[PDB]
Amino acid sequence: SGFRKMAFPSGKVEGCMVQVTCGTTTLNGLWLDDVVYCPRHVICTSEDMLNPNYEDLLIRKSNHNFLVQAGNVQLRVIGHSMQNCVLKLKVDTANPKTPKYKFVRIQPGQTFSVLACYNGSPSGVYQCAMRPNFTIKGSFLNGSCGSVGFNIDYDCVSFCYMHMELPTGVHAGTDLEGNFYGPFVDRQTAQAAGTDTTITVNVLAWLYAAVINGDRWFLNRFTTTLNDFNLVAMKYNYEPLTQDHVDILGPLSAQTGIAVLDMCASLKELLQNGMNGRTILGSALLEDEFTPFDVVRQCSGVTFQ
Amino acid sequence: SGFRKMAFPSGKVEGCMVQVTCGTTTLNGLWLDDVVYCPRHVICTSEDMLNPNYEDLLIRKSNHNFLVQAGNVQLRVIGHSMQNCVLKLKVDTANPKTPKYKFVRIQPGQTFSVLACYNGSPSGVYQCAMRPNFTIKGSFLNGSCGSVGFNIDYDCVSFCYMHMELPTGVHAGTDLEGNFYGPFVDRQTAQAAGTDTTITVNVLAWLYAAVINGDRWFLNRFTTTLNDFNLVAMKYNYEPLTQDHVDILGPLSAQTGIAVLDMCASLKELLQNGMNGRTILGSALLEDEFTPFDVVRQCSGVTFQ
Ligand SMILES: O=c1[nH]cc(-c2cc(-c3cc(Cl)cc(OCCc4ccccc4)c3)c(=O)n(-c3cccnc3)c2)c(=O)[nH]1
Numbered sequence A, B: 001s002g003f004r005k006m007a008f009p010s011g012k013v014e015g016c017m018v019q020v021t022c023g024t025t026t027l028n029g030l031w032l033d034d035v036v037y038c039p040r041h042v043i044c045t046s047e048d049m050l051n052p053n054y055e056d057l058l059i060r061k062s063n064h065n066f067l068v069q070a071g072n073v074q075l076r077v078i079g080h081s082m083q084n085c086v087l088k089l090k091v092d093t094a095n096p097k098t099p100k101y102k103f104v105r106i107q108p109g110q111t112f113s114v115l116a117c118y119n120g121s122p123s124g125v126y127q128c129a130m131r132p133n134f135t136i137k138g139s140f141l142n143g144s145c146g147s148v149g150f151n152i153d154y155d156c157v158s159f160c161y162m163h164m165e166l167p168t169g170v171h172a173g174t175d176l177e178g179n180f181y182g183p184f185v186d187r188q189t190a191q192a193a194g195t196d197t198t199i200t201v202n203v204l205a206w207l208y209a210a211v212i213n214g215d216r217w218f219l220n221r222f223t224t225t226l227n228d229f230n231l232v233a234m235k236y237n238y239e240p241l242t243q244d245h246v247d248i249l250g251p252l253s254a255q256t257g258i259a260v261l262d263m264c265a266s267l268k269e270l271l272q273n274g275m276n277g278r279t280i281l282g283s284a285l286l287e288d289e290f291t292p293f294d295v296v297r298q299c300s301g302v303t304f305q
């Protein structure tokens, strides 16, 4: 019993964090096999940030200008290249703590764990989600650039996120191939996020989690249709629900005996009437950063090693 | 910017989790140096649980009846003893991944990270707090017994929590010396929790976190006194605020320029009028599982290794 915002165990990723220094800038890198990955703006000064020409700035950098420190392990840089918005530094030592891993570009709505690091040292871990406007609502301070987000399937780490804080206080970054999520660029120039809508399939998954845990007050006598529900979602800035989403919710439907469309009718009533000062799973608002997989994992206890 | 429920990086503790089997029961143990710590009800059957005499049940157990597996490392048990409600198993190998650690008995209101484990394998990490009734609102399934809670100061792991789920769905356990928090006993017999009050000093710390992050709508024109505020806390099942608590909040007071007693007056108005459908740091209720230290760490970026 109980339902918590739960991150993956971070140990497999902690062994990969290093500090990367170029001139006077220091941020975090990801050391996997004999390559170190970090944001390319490590080569910039605060002044370079307004309109950086990264190809031109890289001309004046050689291997020995990049200092990489793994704790106190000093790493020798033997090559460097730029791939989209990440720098890839070839070092002469394979990381002996490299886990089984893959790089994945996640879709909006998907969740992941963040290991926030500073000066190459992990400081905390938390859960968040790729928002529909391709920002994340993280917790990051200066020096956190190069911190990574990931999921873990048994023994394999799936890295999905690595760059900046917008003036609005939300966060933008890349996949591990260096392509930004959404339209953001690594330049200090006007960029605004776009509508932050609610991840409907995740809210439904969390209502199923609530039923499994005994929070049942929101179940009602009604049902609805996909098209009728989606009219309501549009009014409340909820993402449309698709048949694919209904199928993904099938296992939770089968565990609880509540058809997806009946749960949609409960969500519809919650969106139109509010929670009336009540709570669900300890929350006074509808939570949208648990995926269906998140709910099954935490309500079934799958494990990783 | 941003404020998240943030756990410590779990890697130092992951290397200490093992599986402990006795007869047909399997749960988690903590392997530190050459000792394995686990809940003593590993020696019980489901029937033993109603009224177990642990001293008598232990008579029929020898070293070879305890199977300890560290991943696939098979550990040889060379001694066993019972300390209060934990079993201590002496093994013939020191854990090479033992971190610097201490055992600490925490006070109600204090927070810690939980590494939920099953069959000796970590499955997720989250934050929670010792409630004033000495339960914790965890997320645990069958097989999670022996999972531990901890804090980390730079390189030293402070283990504070290790046992059962009450019929109400909240959780009870011991410190690493085997003494339960609060009045609970490791027996399947009627036990009820006691009033769950709100941790006032933590709520104030979280309001300071909100101000630091730009959530300022709840700041008002008023102030109050310690005695006047505490009359309001009592009415709303909030813990009394002491002068010691005011001093602990001093650094946040100094960072924001808001006297503690003015912040109390803002909290008073929030308790009497509610949030009026607004949110603070993404929450529609007053959050009480961030300590003042939690707020400073996350708003200053302290790091651990
Ligand atoms: O030695 C270092 N110098 C700099 C950083 C660093 C750099 C940035 C950074 C990097 C770039 Cl290309 C651009 C940028 O502004 C773009 C967003 C924007 C748009 C419009 C107006 C203003 C801003 C910001 C940053 O956000 N942060 C940051 C701050 C808080 C949370 N997360 C990231 C940190 C670092 O870790 N190390």
Ligand SMILES: O=c1[nH]cc(-c2cc(-c3cc(Cl)cc(OCCc4ccccc4)c3)c(=O)n(-c3cccnc3)c2)c(=O)[nH]1
Pocket (backbone or CB within 6 Å): A001, B024, B025, B026, B027, B041, B049, B140, B141, B142, B143, B144, B145, B163, B164, B165, B166, B167, B185, B186, B187, B188, B189, B190, B191
């Ligand atoms: O092989 C194993 N057998 C058993 C366990 C186990 C044992 C218990 C357990 C252990 C004891 Cl002495 C007593 C007990 O009931 C006491 C609380 C209570 C009071 C009144 C009525 C009912 C209950 C419960 C448990 O909660 N859980 C549990 C369940 C969910 C979350 N957390 C813990 C697990 C295990 O991990 N391995």
